[PDB]
Each structure stands twice: as C-alpha cells, then as structure tokens.
Design a protein around this nucleic acid. Structure first.
Lengths: 141, 59, 110, 77, 187
RNA sequence: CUGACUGGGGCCUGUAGAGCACUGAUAGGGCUAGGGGGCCCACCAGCCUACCAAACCCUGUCAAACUCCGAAGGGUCCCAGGUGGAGCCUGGGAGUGAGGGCGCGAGCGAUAACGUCCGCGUCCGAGCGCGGGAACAACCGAGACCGCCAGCUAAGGCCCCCAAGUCUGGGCUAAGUGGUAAAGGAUGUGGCGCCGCGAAGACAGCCAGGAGGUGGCUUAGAAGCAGCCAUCCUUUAAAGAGUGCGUAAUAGCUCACUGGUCGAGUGGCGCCGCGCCGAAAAUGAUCGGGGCUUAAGCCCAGCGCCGAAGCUGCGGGUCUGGG
RNA sequence: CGCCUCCUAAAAGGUAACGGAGGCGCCCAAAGGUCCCCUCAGGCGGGACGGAAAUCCGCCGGAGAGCGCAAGGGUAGAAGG
RNA sequence: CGAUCAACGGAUAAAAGUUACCCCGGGGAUAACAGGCUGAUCUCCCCCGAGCGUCCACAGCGGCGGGGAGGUUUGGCACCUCGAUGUCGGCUCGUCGCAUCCUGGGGCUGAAGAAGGUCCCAAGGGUUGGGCUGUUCGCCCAUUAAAGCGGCACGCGAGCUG
RNA sequence: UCCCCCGUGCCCAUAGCGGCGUGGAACCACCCGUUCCCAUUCCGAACACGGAAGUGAAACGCGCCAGCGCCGAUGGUACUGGGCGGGCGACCGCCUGGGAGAGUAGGUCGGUGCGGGGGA
C-alpha cells in the first residue's frame, strides 16, 4: 500500500506528537473532510483500510482525497528478543497526525453519502475525528 | 523605591540558581524580610524568585 | 553575473587590499590613463594624476611615464612613499607598467 | 542481528572562541571553524585550517557584510 | 452583498480575554490606517459564512464609521478549527486584488457520464475596482467529459476585472469516479 | 570583592517553531516530453490512449541526518549590584568514581515497563528527622542545636475515628458517580446557542378518505409493494401508474397526503457541565473506615479555623565574625 | 575495539546507548609554492560522422559543478581549470 | 628507520581449549524457578460492517481495520531472594474466580416438535474409568448430563514419589 | 555651492533580473591597424601597443516602469524562559516574561563617501 518508494534513511526516530497540525488543516480539495482531534500515528494498512471503506460506501462517483501519507518508517524488533543489539526492523510506514489535520477529503458526493462514508472511515481509524465541511474558513485557506 | 522582601516559601526542590538568587538578596530563612532598594539587578533576582517570595514596595 | 574582467579586478584588488598599504588605482582608457592613491580604511582618494588632466601626447606608454612621474611627485609632496600598486584588471605591462615605473622613476616606493 | 552503525569521531570543539567587544592578545585563536564561516579582516590572520586569530592586540570586532560573508576584526585599543 | 458588522477598537486588552469574551480579535488597515480591533465571534461567523473573502464587508464602527472593507486574512485555531483573528483589509479606493467566487453553470457531460467534478480553484484571484466587485463568474461546464479540465485562459471576465493568475492555471477537472466496481479487484 | 545570582550592553547559536529556497519524500491536477497500447502498420510515419509516464506549472503536504528563515532561551566579555561556610592561589587529608526517583527535553524500547541510556533541575542517597499524602526515599509542605502544658502559619484538612465549620451564598450529580480504563453507544440530566412550523392554527391524539386507464423494459403473466426502463394527466378535499402485508391474482391494512376535533408548544440541530453502559480472575470486603445524597460529592465564590520540629516568643547551648 | 563526517545532541562546548548513517589505515614530486590567465553544472537552439551524452557555436546559469577519496563545512571577488 | 604494539594509552620479545571429576572467594551488582512491573505475544471481549447468509449487514456470521480487559502462554526488565525461595510430572488435600461443560432461568432464531445455534443471568453441586507417553498436553477406547478453563510459588516434597 | 561624467569605497538586492527610453560636448566605450611592447593550448576574441575613420549599435551612464525578484509591516499565533495545574497515557490548559517563521498591508527599478574632470 502507501509507502515512500525510496528514502534517504530507512530507519528513523520516533519523535514527539505535541503541537497542532502544522499544514493541511482545512478543506482544500474535496467537499467534506474528516479532521483529526487527537494526536496519533496511522499505519498505511489503517489509512488504506479507511480509504477502501470509504470507496465501498460511496461505491459510485466521488473522489477520496488522502491528505496524509505514511512515510515515517514504523519500527519494531523481532518478537521475543532482548532489548538492545541494534534498532528494530521497519515494521511499516506510518504517518504522524496531530489535531486539526484534514486527513480525508471526499468530493463529488452527496452530503449524506460523504458524511456516512467518512463516519465509517473514522471507525476504521484509531483516533477520534470530526467530519466537517468546506467553508469560507476553508475558502479563506 | 525600597522593597520589603518577605521570604514566604521554602527553596527546597527548586533549582540551585533560584536558591542562589535567594542568597543574593540575603534571604536565608522563611518569614525573613529585607527592605532593599529597587535596583534593576536586585529587582532582577526578585523577579526571578517572585513565586517564592513576597514583594512589598516600601520606602 | 561577473566577467573575467570584473572577477580579475576584484581578484587583484582584494589581493592588495589584504596588505593594508595604500593602493594605487590605475585607469587605462583608450585615449587616457588615470591613476591615484587611496586609503581604503578611509575610502579617501588622496592624490589624483591623469593623462586627461596633464594634457599630454605621444606614445601612450611614454605618457604613462609622464603621469607616473607626476603622480609620484605630488605624492612625495604628500610624503606617501610606501604604496601598493593596483594594476587592477590590467595586465602589468605597457602603459600601466611604464606608468608604475614613472612613479618609481618619480621617486616613489614600491 | 548486528550493527553496522555505532561509531562516531571525537568532538572538535569548533566555533568562535572570542566574541565581539572582548579584549585579546595577538596570536590568540578566535574562530576554530571549518571552511570560512567568518572571513578574517582587519588584523585577523587565518591559519591553514581556516582558524582565525588576532594579528594584533585590541578588540574583537564581528562584522557581517551580507553577500560578502561574515568578517572578524581586531581593532586595536 | 453588503454584509455589515459592528467594529470595536481593542486598545490593549489581551486577546485571550476577548476570545474568552466571544470577541474575535482582529485588525483593519490599508496603506493609510491600522487599528487593533475586535468583533463578536458569533457575529463574524454568521456574516462571514455569508461574508467570505469574496464579499464586501462594511464594518459598523463605534464612532459611526462604516468602512466597506474586506477580510484579507483570518487566523484559525487549528486545535478547534475556529477563527482567532481577522485581517480586515479596509476596502478603500485604488482597485485591489481579492478572490471572487466561481459559478460552474451547468454540468460536465462526463459528470453526466458518471464523472466526478473536481474544483481545482473554488475562487478566482482578481484585482478589480474596490466599488465594482463582481460576486460571480459563471463557467460553461456543459462541454465537459470525464478527464476534462478548464484553465484561466477560458474564463470570460466582466469589464474592469483582471485575471490575477496565469492563464494556463487550471480551475477544475472532470476526473474518473470512485467506484466499488474497481474494488473487488482490490480486495 | 573578584564568587553564585542579578540588571545593562555587545556578540556567538541554528534548536523548538515555521517553510519548501536546497536535498529527498509526497497527494491530486494541468501540461507534456518519452515509453505502452490501439489502429497505422512499415514504403513511415501519422491519428487516438480515461496507460504509464520526464520536466515544469498549480493546489496540498512531509523531514533527526532538508533549511529561504528562526525564537524563546543558552554561552562569553565588560560595566553595575552582589560580604557569601562566597571567590581565587598554594599546600594536607579525603572519600567518591553500583546511584536512584521525580519533572522536562531526546534515543532505544512497543511513544511498555518501579525498563535502559543521555542532558537540564530537583530530592533521596546522606534528610526512612517533621506535617500531609491511610499506610509509602525521592509527590505536596518543610532543611530538625536544645527546652517550654506559648502563638501565627505551610501542604493539607474542618461530619465521627481525628483538630478545625454538619459554616455561608450559587450551581450541577442521583451514578454512591464521587469512591478507577478506552473506543463506541445512548430520549440521563442541566444549561447554552441555531434552525421548523406554529390561529391564511403547530407537533399532537383522533377521526374520514388516500384513486384511476393500470398501460412500460412486460416478464416470474404483481399497472403498485417482483427483477427493471419508465413515472401522463385525470377523477374540481384533489392521495403515489404506492411506502411497507394480499399481490407467480384482486384484495383489504396502512402510509405521504384532504378537512375538521381539539389549542400550545412542538420538532430537529450543534456546544458545554455533570452522569450511564461499555466494565469478567482467582483467601473477605471496603471511599483509610464509619457513614455520606439541597452531601459529608463536584465546580465557583467567602470568611474563619485547624494544622510541622517552618516561623514567631521566652530561656539556654554552641560556631563564625564584630566589638 | 583506533581515528574522520553527520544526526542523536535539547541555537555555546560537551554530552550515552550492542542508537541512526557512512568513511580512513592512503594519495599527490605534482594534486606542493609563487606569478599570470580562465570560470562551471546545467538547459535551449543550430551544427558530418555524432548518438541522449564526444568536439563546435550562440543563447540563459551565483554555483545546483568542481574542489584525489566518506560526510560535512568552505568556496567562483576561487580553494575550481 | 623496524609497529594490524588494530584489544590501536600499546600487561611478555614469546601463549590455545575443556571440565557434569571439580574446588575457593564473591554476587540477587547477574541469568535458570518462582514472585514483581509492562501485556509485545497469549486468552477473552467490544467498535465499523464488506460480504455471506432465496433475499436479509447483524439466526449464524464479521473481510479490511479499530478499542479494550485480563495477567493463565511465550516474552521484556532485572526489583527482593545466589551465608539457598527445591524447579517438571504424578499422588493427597483441597480453596477460589467465572471468561459456565452439565445441571437451574431466560432472549433471539434461518426456533413446526425434538434436537439445535447464539447470547444473557446463573459458581450450589458435579464435572467418569482406561490405553499410550516421565510427561502436563494430546490422541484414542467406553461412557456420561457433562466429561469446563484457570488461580492459588505454572498450589501443595519440614505431605509422598523421583 | 548645483548638475553630468570617470574612477574608486561603504551599506549588501528596497542595491538584482526584466522591459522602456536616452547620452557622445567631455568621458568612456565600441572602434582603426598590428610595425613595435605583448599574446593566443588557433585566433589582435582576450591580452598589448600606436591611433583616432566612424559610432553611441553594443557596452556602459542616467532616468521610467513593481512583470520578476528582493525587503516587509501591524496585528495574531505557533513556540518558549518562569510559576502553576490537568491528563492513565499519548499529550493539554492557565498566569507571567519573551516571541516568531508564514501570510497580509506595504516598500524598493538604491543610499551614501572619496578623488578627478567638465558644465553651471
């Protein structure tokens, strides 16, 4: 699934999550958006799962907008190994997300369809979210 | 002006720098007052330990 | 964007500015040759000689002997003796070189 | 597993040693740098390793010139 | 249209308080004036939802001033997705640049063919007269199929209006849909 | 007098932040090389490609090893304060070189560990001396010379145990929450704000009817409740070639809808506080217990009071310095 | 297991981990000194062989090239040729 | 000038293994058992509902993902114990939890009845004998209403065995 | 003392790129040759010398333009010293001091010194 095709560093540190969504915090492309409401990571399995859920619910028309990309290499050691002796392997590619992030934008869809599909995608994701709409706030963005 | 200074909280557990600021004002124990002229330096330390100490502007 | 000319000029003049002694700027036009000494720490042109002002003629190089001696003489009137010869973007030869000679020939130190 | 990584060179302690408005003696190190982060100027000589040092005595004088990079000056007393 | 709103002059009050008081911190200005101001949060929300950047906004100043102005910029609490400060561009004379809305009049025939209309730019960048600001520029979106898009080189503008962007800068595209028909191949 | 510390000033920094100007990553477009395809097809090119796809452009992002920038802060020099179990120099003697908890900033780890490893601060260590926290080294208060049957206070408490208010005013909770956990769910409750219709009368209970040719892709022969291709006007409340049962057949029920009978809210939104479920481990339970419901819970506001070895008062001891 | 570069490393320095990355155990008699002279990469367009890219030319280029080798820093107003 | 004195501040100019035949000093500074913290893994349980289920998401189901609980697995850490905390298994004796196998009650059903499936309440009682194997475990034999999962230092050696 | 030019300088783009116009009195440049000085990894291109036929075409000088670029407010906020709490945690609030980058407004088609020459 979603994963950087190449990177200057395979492994990578974890880092802090404190702060707000730096960029991409307004409805930019789609009509409706599912903003995060709590800082957390998301795996490409999670993101892609939520996308597949959305495309299922829509099932016709519309266009999912994945305004986040799982580039940070998630890392865990082999199971049942003592600590140390190097850093764990690249278990997967996650994407850090803070509150305010417009994670998903759906457009080309009725209101109710987009609202519901984004709701389901919210259930598929590990963070409390907030379906929203593009407004003059977004229009000013 | 002058500044009656009432040490009104222990310095234990606070960083040693703040304690040294207490020593700069000469404050040594709780409930200790010291009227000291409001100079930018002395008021510097006093502002540095405002949370620990009471500042009453006197003459 | 610079030129070989411009880059060369900053090249020599930086090389001489690094010294500290007075620089001897040298201008060599097609019909005239100009020269001067300046204190870079003051940005002040002290003495100014020029074929244009001196009203000379003949071999332009020989005219550089003329103005070289002249500027050397005025400088000696100013007492400045140790001074850096700025050949600028010019190749040290011909009019510029012989002018520097006339400054040496004029009794100046470099 | 193994570890390709895990090695690093000693610390160099590079950088500026004397700041502007700080009296110094001639021959003292100023900018233990790499390359010319500061270009030497008035009374500022530079060793082979780009190190800047006071040619004369006097005062440390830091002076940037924008496109002309950051200079250092020892202007005597 | 004219969307008025009472304007208040915050003097030195901490905007934490004013925001706490439902008073939206802000500032109106031009190349001549500049005033730290504050307005009602809920008022400016009500109006601004109608009174987005596309629309003239007339501040109802406390002294009686009524400046027909514009919100050149607005700060948003990323944590709450709430406004937190307004940049009132006091719309004086000397025609200035702003964002006009965009009217996709019709339907792309590819959208009629199942296509999905993606609006690249939902507003337009134009420097027009401050007192002759058109609020609409409709678009001939009928002659469009799936895979089609429009650019600045085709928008027809009213008099005194100026395209403030590249003519090649697109505005919207008719993209393929999102279909479960292509999903069972994906599961 | 130089010290810690402080103020003034100078300057050095690339971190957080931010941003894409470089490096890469990157979402979607435009455009478009180019390669893939289709014809064209070789005699060589050419037309299309909703194929991929350079580069660039736009929109949107991302970064510890990216930086067009960039704090707060930190470092240093000088000036000023700063007399302190301060500072500096030289000698003597050390012991220590297993540290740990806590907070913050990182790495590892699983953003797990009373984990590990670092930086900064702190405390314990050595202060398991004291009050609180029930009990508890590092959490809160507070650095114990001593004695006193004196007082003010700290954290924290004031319904009994147990000292101080069943103290005052205002709210909210009904779960013993309080007195344990999430996602998620919910006519819980309270309070907000927004929208709908409300007497050319609302929801509301009622009531009376609510349809036709009947026909179409006409076939699983149901014009309508079955798979779909459909959805004309009209039966002068006007109710659909229907919304769900009988319909490989009608029915009849009902519904949207037509009047009136009542006659005042009704209805739906989003926010906030406090609650409910979600919530199952192993000897007997428990908020520390008792018990606690306009609280003895939670939040806000007040005053007062209690409260230590803190401080103050008195008396004494002892060390340093000054007489 | 020694040394170099970077991040870790918290805008001074330093700073740990069997943390994240790579390098060195030489080379140049010129790849050193000095004097003088020149400026690249790259792209376009045109140009026999000849290409994508040889050499040529004109046009735009601040350094994105190069600088013996890792990285970084430095750098054309040269350390590059 | 002779250094892979590279274990690179370089113990000799000169040096590899094994010990269950072992011994001494120490260490809970440090592992194996247990206990402890975490719950990665493990068990269980909920969220979404794709799809299945003539149809019908939700009788039974539950893709993709998510959130939990527990603390029985294997793990991680190494905190007490290395001047001793006896380690698997079986026997005896039990006590307890409930995430209930049967027995009690109930809901729904894709429940005609019977037998069922699932879920809810329910821990009073019961939960067999044997073959194999050191085994627990598991398979099998024959039954049963059933032939529960676990905790109790993977209970129990100053109770047995070995 | 003013204007123009020519050389230098400092500030380091608001100073640059671009387009436009303009300069020959002087200055300068281009230029006219290469015997000489000097030179081309070929070439008078550059370099260098002698000279002034011609030209301001280029270059350069100066003005105009904000197209690019660059600079950039004010506010606001992120962020943070310090002191407080909250949160199981990831992380979050408050008071106190500082305070961005981004954008916005807007601003810039340079300022200034020295010397020389020319003109007023």
């Amino acid at each position: 699934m979603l994963m950087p095709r190449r990177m200057k560093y395979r492994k990578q540190q974890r880092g802090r999550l404190k702060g707000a969504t730096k960029g991409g915090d307004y409805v930019a492309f789609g009509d409706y958006g599912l903003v995060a409401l709590e800082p957390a990571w998301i795996t490409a399995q999670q993101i892609e799962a939520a996308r597949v859920a959305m495309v299922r619910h829509f099932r016709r028309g519309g266009k999912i907008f994945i305004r986040i990309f799982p580039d940070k290499p998630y890392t865990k050691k082999p199971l049942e190994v003592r600590m140390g002796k190097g850093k764990g392997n690249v278990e997967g590619y996650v994407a850090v997300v803070k509150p305010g992030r417009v994670m998903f934008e759906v457009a080309g869809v009725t209101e109710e369809q987009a609202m519901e599909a984004l709701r389901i995608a919210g259930h598929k994701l590990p963070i409390k979210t907030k379906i929203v709409r593009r407004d003059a706030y977004d229009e000013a963005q | 002006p002058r500044l009656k200074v009432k040490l009104v909280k222990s310095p234990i557990g606070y960083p040693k720098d703040q304690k040294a600021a207490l020593k700069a004002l000469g404050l040594r124990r709780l409930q200790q007052e010291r009227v000291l002229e409001d100079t930018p330096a002395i008021r510097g330390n006093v502002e540095k330990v405002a949370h620990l100490v009471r500042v009453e502007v006197v003459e | 964007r610079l030129t070989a000319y411009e880059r060369r000029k900053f090249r020599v003049r930086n090389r001489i500015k690094r010294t500290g002694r007075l620089r001897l700027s040298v201008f060599r036009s097609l019909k005239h040759i100009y020269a001067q000494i300046i204190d870079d720490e003051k940005g002040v042109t002290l003495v100014s000689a020029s074929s244009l002002a001196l009203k000379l003629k003949g071999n332009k190089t020989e005219v550089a002997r003329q103005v070289g001696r002249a500027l050397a003489e005025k400088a000696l009137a100013l007492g400045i003796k140790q001074v850096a010869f700025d050949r600028g973007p010019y190749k040290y030869h011909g009019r510029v070189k012989a002018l520097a000679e006339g400054a040496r020939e004029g009794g100046l130190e470099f | 597993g193994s570890t390709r990584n895990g090695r690093d060179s000693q610390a160099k302690r590079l950088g500026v040693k004397r700041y502007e408005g700080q009296v110094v003696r001639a021959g003292n190190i100023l900018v233990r740098q790499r390359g010319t982060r500061f270009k030497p100027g008035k009374n500022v000589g530079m060793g082979r390793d780009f190190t800047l040092f006071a040619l004369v005595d006097g005062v440390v004088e830091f002076q940037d010139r924008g496109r002309l990079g950051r200079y250092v000056h020892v202007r005597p007393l | 249209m004219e969307y008025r709103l009472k304007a208040y002059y915050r003097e030195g009050e901490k905007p934490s308080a004013l925001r706490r008081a439902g008073k939206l911190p802000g500032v109106m200005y031009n190349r001549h004036l500049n005033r730290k101001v504050y307005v009602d949060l809920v008022e400016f929300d009500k109006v601004f939802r109608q009174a987005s950047i596309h629309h003239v906004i007339v501040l109802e100043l406390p002294d009686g001033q009524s400046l027909p102005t514009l919100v050149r910029q607005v700060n948003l609490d990323k944590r709450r997705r709430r406004p937190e400060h307004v940049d009132f561009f006091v719309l004086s004379d000397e025609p200035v640049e702003m964002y006009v809305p965009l009217r996709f009049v019709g339907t792309p025939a590819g959208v009629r063919a199942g296509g999905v209309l993606q609006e690249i730019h939902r507003d337009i960048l134009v420097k027009v007269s401050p007192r002759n600001i058109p609020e609409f520029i409709e678009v001939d979106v009928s002659g469009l199929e799936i895979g089609d898009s429009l650019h600045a080189s085709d928008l027809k503008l009213p008099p005194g209006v100026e395209l403030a962007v590249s003519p090649e800068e697109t505005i919207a595209a008719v993209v393929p849909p999102e279909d479960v028909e292509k999903l069972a191949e994906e599961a």
